[PDB]
Amino acid sequence: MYGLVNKAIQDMISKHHGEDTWEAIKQKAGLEDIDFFVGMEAYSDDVTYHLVGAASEVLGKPAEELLIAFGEYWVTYTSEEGYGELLASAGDSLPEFMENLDNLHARVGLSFPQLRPPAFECQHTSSKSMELHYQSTRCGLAPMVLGLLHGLGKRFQTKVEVTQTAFRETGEDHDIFSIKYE
Ligand code: HEM
Find the CATH number of the domain harbouring 63: 3.90.1520.10
Measured in Å, residue 117 CA sits from the centre of ligand 1 at: 6
Pocket lining: 123 vs ligand 1, CB cutoff 6 Å = no
Q: Is 86 in the pocket of ligand 1 (CB under 6 A)?
A: yes
Residue 180 forms beta bridges with which residues?
A: 129, 161
Pocket test of ligand 1: the residue of 104, 156, 168, 176 to mutate, having most ligand atoms within 8 Å of its CB, is 104
Say yes or no: CB of residue 130 within 6 Å of ligand 1.
no
Q: How many residues comprise the chain? A: 182
Contact 118, 148 (CB under 8 A): no
Of residues 106, 95, 182, 169, the one with CA closest to residue 132 = 95
C-alpha 5 – ligand 1 centre gap (Å): 8
Burial of 78 (0-12, 13-18, 19+ CB in 10 A): middle
Among 154, 101, 169, 106, residue whose Cα is nearest residue 130 = 101
Final resolution, Å: 2.6
Instruction: Could you list the residues known to form a binding site, using ranges.
Output: 2, 74, 105, 116, 134, 136, 138
Ligand 1 geometric centre to CA of 15 (Å)? 21
Range of the domain at 13: 1-182
Handedness of CA 42, 51, 13, 157 (dihedral sign): positive
Spell out the residues 6+ positions from residue 39 whose beta carbon is closer than 8 angstroms to its own. 2, 3, 4, 7
- Euclidean distance between CA atoms 172 and 129, whole angstroms: 22
- Binding-site members for heme b are 2, 74, 105, 116, 134, 136, 138
In degrees rounded to 5, what are phi and psi of residue 123? -110, 115
Distance of CA 97 to the CA centre of its chain: 15
β pairing state of 119-126 and 160-166: unpaired
What experimental approach yielded this model?
Answer: X-ray
Please calculate the CA angle 167-100-37 and round it to the nearest 5 degrees: 75
104: phi then psi, degrees, rounded to nearest 5: -55, -50
Give the whole-angstrom CA distance, residue 162 versus residue 71.
Answer: 13
Number of structural domains the chain divides into:
1
